C-alpha cells in the first residue's frame, strides 16, 4: 500500500520579462528585429536582432548595439555605460 | 505528399549532379550554364504540395530531421555528413528559408527535447552548415533553439550550485532536470491552459527553480509546459516492485493514491486542478494500463467516478512508460 518520492521529475520553466519600449539607436520597438534587420529578412544578418538588455536595465535589437559600440559605449535611453546582462525574443 | 522529403531532395540532386557534370565536361564549367543551372533549381525548388501552402522549405525540414534523428543508424556519421552536404546545395535554392527554419525548428525542437537526434554534433555541424549556405538569419532560431539545448547543462548545474550555495543544503528529495526555451526562437506555444496544481513532492523544485531561472533571461515567457513533463513513478504497494514512467499529470493522479487507495474524479480534480479533458485522458492512460480501477460499472470516466488502485496490477516489465499524448 506504497508510492513514495525516490526520484521524480516533471518541469516548471519561468517568471516573466518582456521589454516595453524602443531601441533608441533606430526608434523601433526592442522585440520585433532591428530596422535593418527587419526590412532584409533574407539578408544574412536579419533574423538575429532580437532583444539584448545591458547592466543600464535598458534593452536594444542586439545588431543595433553590437553596430553602435562603435561609437561611445552608453545606451541612448538613459546613457549609462553598456554590458551585456540579458537576452530574449 | 507521404515522402515527399526524401523523394524530392534526391530527386532535385539527381538533376543538379547530372547537370555540373555536363556543365563541367561539355561547357568547360562556365559559370553563366551553372547559373542557369542554379536559376532553374531555384524554379524548380519553390514546388508545393497539392492544395498546400509552399511545402518545399517543410520537406526540406522532414528530410533533414529524418537524417538528423537516431534512426540514420546503419549509415555512419560521415555518410549522413555527405547527404546533409547535398542537402545543402538543395537548401540554397529555397526562397521561403524563414518557414524552413519554423518547420525545421518545430522537428528540431521535438528532436531536443525528446533526444530523438543521432548527434548533438551532428545538428550542430547541420545547423553551422546551414548557416554557411543561408547565412544567419536562417539559423538564428534554431542556432538560438540548440543554444538553449546546450546552456542548458550549465543552467542545470547553475542550479545544482544555487542550491548548494544558499546557507542550508537544501535537498529537493527528487531528481530534477529541466530545459529553457526561448519563445520567438522555438516553435512551443503551448500555454499551460491548466492550471495544475503540482503535486507537493515537485512543488519545492519548481518553485527554487522558478526563483534561480528568473535571474538570468527575458523576451517572450516560457511557462510550467506540465503536459511535456515526465517522470517516475514506483509502486510500492504490489507483489513486485514496478517503475512507470509517467506524465507529471499521470503522476499527479498517481500521487493521490498516497492518500488514499480510492480516490473520487472530484478529489483528483480538486487535488491536481486538472481540466476535466485531460484529467479525464490521464485516468483513461492509467486504466487502460490497469494502474487504477473504475468502482463504476462503466470502466470509463465522468465527474462522480471513483477510482480504486490496482492492488493486482501485474505488467510483464518491471519498468514500463505510459506515453499519454500530452508529450
Not at chain 1, 53 to 71: E, M, P, Q, Y
Not at chain 2, 15 to 30: E, R, S
Not at chain 2, 249 to 278: C, G, H, I, P, R
Amino acid at each position: 500500500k506504497r508510492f513514495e518520492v525516490k526520484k521524480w521529475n516533471a518541469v516548471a520553466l519561468w517568471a516573466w520579462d518582456i521589454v516595453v519600449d524602443n531601441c533608441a539607436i533606430c526608434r523601433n520597438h526592442i522585440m520585433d528585429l532591428c530596422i535593418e534587420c527587419q526590412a532584409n529578412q533574407a539578408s544574412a544578418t536579419s533574423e538575429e536582432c532580437t532583444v539584448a538588455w545591458g547592466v543600464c536595465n535598458h534593452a536594444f535589437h542586439f545588431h543595433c548595439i553590437s553596430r553602435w559600440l562603435k561609437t561611445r559605449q552608453v545606451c541612448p535611453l538613459d546613457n549609462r555605460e553598456w554590458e551585456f546582462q540579458k537576452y530574449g525574443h | 505528399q507521404e515522402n515527399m522529403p526524401t523523394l524530392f531532395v534526391e530527386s532535385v540532386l539527381e538533376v543538379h549532379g547530372k547537370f555540373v557534370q555536363l556543365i563541367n565536361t561539355v561547357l568547360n564549367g562556365d559559370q553563366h550554364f551553372m547559373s542557369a543551372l542554379d536559376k532553374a533549381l531555384t524554379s524548380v525548388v519553390n514546388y508545393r504540395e497539392p492544395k498546400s501552402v509552399c511545402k518545399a522549405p517543410e520537406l526540406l525540414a522532414k528530410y533533414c530531421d529524418n537524417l538528423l534523428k537516431k534512426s540514420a543508424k546503419g549509415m555512419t556519421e560521415n555518410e549522413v555528413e555527405d547527404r546533409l552536404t547535398s542537402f545543402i546545395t538543395v537548401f540554397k535554392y529555397i526562397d521561403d528559408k524563414d518557414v524552413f527554419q519554423k518547420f525545421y525548428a518545430r522537428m528540431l525542437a521535438k528532436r531536443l527535447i525528446h533526444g530523438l537526434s543521432m548527434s548533438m554534433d551532428s545538428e550542430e555541424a547541420m545547423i553551422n552548415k546551414l548557416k554557411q549556405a543561408c547565412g544567419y538569419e536562417f539559423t538564428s532560431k534554431l542556432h538560438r533553439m540548440y543554444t538553449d539545448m546546450s546552456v542548458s547543462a550549465d543552467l542545470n548545474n547553475k542550479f545544482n550550485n544555487f542550491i548548494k550555495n544558499q546557507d542550508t543544503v537544501i535537498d529537493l528529495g527528487i531528481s530534477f532536470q529541466i530545459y529553457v526555451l526561448q519563445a520567438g526562437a522555438w516553435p512551443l506555444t503551448q500555454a499551460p491552459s491548466s492550471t495544475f496544481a503540482i503535486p507537493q513532492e515537485l512543488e519545492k523544485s519548481v518553485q527554487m527553480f522558478e526563483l534561480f531561472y528568473s535571474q538570468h533571461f527575458s523576451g517572450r515567457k516560457l511557462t510550467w509546459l506540465h503536459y511535456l513533463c515526465t517522470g517516475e513513478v514506483k509502486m510500492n504497494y504490489l507483489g513486485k516492485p514496478y517503475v512507470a514512467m509517467v506524465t507529471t499529470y499521470q503522476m499527479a493522479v498517481l500521487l493521490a493514491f498516497n492518500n488514499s487507495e480510492t480516490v473520487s474524479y472530484k478529489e483528483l480534480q480538486d487535488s491536481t486542478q486538472m481540466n476535466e479533458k485531460e484529467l479525464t485522458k490521464t485516468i483513461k492512460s492509467l486504466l487502460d494500463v490497469k494502474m487504477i480501477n473504475h468502482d463504476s460499472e462503466k470502466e470509463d470516466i465522468d465527474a462522480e467516478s471513483s477510482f480504486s488502485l490496482n492492488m493486482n496490477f501485474s505488467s510483464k516489465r518491471t519498468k514500463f512508460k505510459i506515453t499519454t499524448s500530452m508529450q
